[PDB]
Design a protein around this ligand. Structure first.
Ligand SMILES: C[S@@+](CC[C@H](N)C(=O)[O-])C[C@H]1O[C@@H](n2cnc3c(N)ncnc32)[C@H](O)[C@@H]1O
Ligand SMILES: C[S@@+](CC[C@H](N)C(=O)[O-])C[C@H]1O[C@@H](n2cnc3c(N)ncnc32)[C@H](O)[C@@H]1O
Ligand SMILES: [Cl-]
Ligand SMILES: [Cl-]
Lengths: 380, 380
């Protein structure tokens, strides 16, 4: 009854994550001035370049040079020796207004509660009782390993660290009536950009002793655990110089680490009318509410939309056999307790608030008691 | 025991799909001259612009202007009246060599069969016996609706059509011992870019009669089926002008439509050493081999890698209760029958062949008897 499952995470200076953070820094800058900004900001990163491309209609006056550079500064790319520098990189802007054809079909002359979805699409929410925060252990540990690297970089403990990192955790689980129970950590991968002077043995020792042991409970680590620490052997070139980044290329890191499902849409750079984000957040909220409400131990929620139509086209509940109630009964409870129109979600989840840059690293879920993480008390 | 499930697809001129196709046109151009090209080509599209960004180390001499423009021509963007023109758009190139640090850790001085994975990551394969091609009906129908639009555009039947389209299909299913049985089509969405002159009623009538009825069997359509046809009301602005495109932003359209799972990696623009593509193709091959071999009716396969390491770190089989054999037994059969090192996958699936542009619209799976669609005869 045992099986393996693997999830990954990346650090704040991973080039795709740089892009997500910049896209959300732009979104937040707009929302600070215009809560109703329509934002669809993609970011592209390569050696020496941040490009913004997309569509924004907003009353805000935003200094893109400043917003981009401050985001890169925060991440830690502040010198040519690190491969990227906020002070001296190129910032290029290819931003136009939102298509009038989209605007007229989605939101113009519509009551806010009755605004249409900003696009078609499908979205999933997921929750699992295997951790208190209702997230898969695999991805929680992977995120925490990247956070630990950033912490030890920023506090000067391991000053050879640079911002670009990736981690991956394989856990052995036991099946438990549709729920899953972590047993042990089978394999850990860590790759992190480093300075030219530190040797592989120093890095591997530090990664085990100061990173892994500081994050992963000893009860999960044993003589059989496999460690792949700096497995490429050399990672001096990194950030956008090593690998191009784009917004919305870490959508599984952003969500459930391979568990559950994904509808394909990216989160970062998008205001609440883009259901790719708002409906995914609401679907997480539903899933977590079902688990915290004691209705099931593990659950997947699907919703879908048509552009210009407010109400979801479909809603589906999959409980993995972890409830006494049927999936049909759970769906009825969901429909009686939630209104998944985007113009209602915005109110319930406070989605005009400029907190989005905070969501753009270390996963959008399972952290910091954002509104979608505070379960709804269900009536049934 | 019934439930809904929704999947989407997009057309060849959807701006994200333009990027995928261009990325794979670049890959194919390199492979035609250098079968061992190392390619990581991202494409970005916005009004008047195709940008190539990424990393290529190759002996080929490739004319990027020509390759990009020919790809856009094929898609159908050939006039300013359509919002984009291959003849007159900007093509910008920000391509550098592959990082030497990656090269040394992955492939330099390694026996081909023993080359390391080109990155860490996780990948899934999926197969379902609900269709002959072992794909979810929801996504098969969604793809076919986009293909029909392109067909009627190109044959001049509906000459108001333009290349940018999206479709979405919701099917009502019955549960069947872990397998799924389609019952009916619950909802169809179609949005397609159109000329300034055609009216909404003409379009909606044509979309129902000449597109939907030509694709979806009548047995699935009934008086209750919901149709959202041009639901935005107006879609004259389209292509990159309406919405920025990026490579690797349609990864669920490329795969299983929300069914199964995804590890996050994009396919297009990448050579075989990038396990995001090759291992996902191999995992599809495994899944389809299990179903076609009669070992299960529906199955999800996970694999994962570390950069620089040839053998997978983990392999997992989830059969939804659709086999008499345990998941442990199926995993043993998989391990005895498949070698998922990237330097073996390349041989089994012929992954140096320049066929990738053909994969970059209408899904990578369930079509055209590519090597990963031809099941392996299993010994057990
Ligand atoms: C391995 S690169 C993807 C492949 C790459 N585009 C190429 O040209 O081969 C993907 C990510 O891995 C990490 N990476 C970059 N250089 C690396 C290195 N030398 N060793 C390990 N990981 C590296 C960075 O986080 C980067 O964004
Ligand atoms: C709706 S746009 C995404 C949101 C957009 N970035 C914005 O600024 O609001 C996503 C996709 O929908 C399609 N689309 C573009 N304009 C549309 C329109 N007027 N009506 C329906 N779909 C449209 C195109 O396929 C496009 O790539
Ligand atoms: Cl990556
Ligand atoms: Cl889209």
């Amino acid at each position: 009854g045992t099986f393996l499952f693997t999830s990954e995470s990346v650090g704040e200076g991973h080039p795709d994550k740089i892009c997500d953070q910049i896209s959300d820094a732009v979104l937040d800058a707009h929302l600070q001035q215009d809560p109703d900004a329509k934002v669809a900001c993609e970011t592209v990163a390569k050696t020496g370049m941040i490009l913004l491309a997309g569509e924004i209609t907003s009353r805000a006056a935003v200094d893109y040079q400043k917003v981009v550079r401050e985001a890169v500064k925060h991440i830690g790319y502040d010198d040519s020796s690190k491969g990227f520098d906020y002070k001296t990189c190129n910032v290029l802007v290819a931003l136009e207004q939102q298509s009038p054809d989209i605007a007229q079909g989605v939101h113009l002359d519509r009551n806010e509660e009755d605004i249409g979805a900003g696009d078609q699409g499908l979205m999933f929410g997921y929750a699992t009782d295997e951790t208190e925060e209702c997230m898969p252990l695999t991805i929680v540990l992977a995120h925490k390993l990247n956070a630990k690297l950033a912490e030890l970089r920023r506090n000067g403990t391991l000053p050879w660290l640079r911002p670009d990192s990736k981690t991956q955790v394989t856990v052995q689980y036991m099946q438990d009536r549709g729920a899953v129970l972590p047993i042990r950590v089978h394999t850990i991968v860590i790759s992190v950009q480093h300075d030219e002077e530190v040797c592989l043995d120093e890095m591997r020792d530090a990664l085990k002793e100061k990173v892994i042991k500081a994050v992963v409970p000893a009860k999960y680590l044993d003589e059989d655990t496999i460690y792949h620490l700096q497995p490429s052997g050399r990672f001096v070139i990194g950030g956008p110089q090593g690998d191009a980044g784009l917004t919305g290329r870490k959508i599984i890191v952003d969500t459930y680490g391979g568990w559950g499902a994904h509808g394909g849409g990216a989160f970062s750079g998008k205001d609440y009318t883009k259901v790719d984000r708002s409906a995914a957040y609401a679907a997480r909220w539903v899933a977590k509410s079902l688990v915290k409400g004691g209705l099931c131990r593990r659950v997947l929620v699907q919703v879908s939309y048509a552009i210009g139509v407010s109400h979801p086209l479909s809603i589906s509940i999959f409980h993995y056999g972890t409830s006494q109630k049927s999936e049909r009964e759970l769906l009825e409870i969901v429909k009686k307790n939630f209104d998944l129109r985007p113009g209602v979600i915005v109110r319930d989840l406070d989605l005009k608030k400029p907190i989005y840059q905070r969501t753009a690293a270390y996963g959008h879920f399972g952290r910091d008691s954002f509104p979608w993480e505070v379960p709804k008390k269900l009536k049934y």
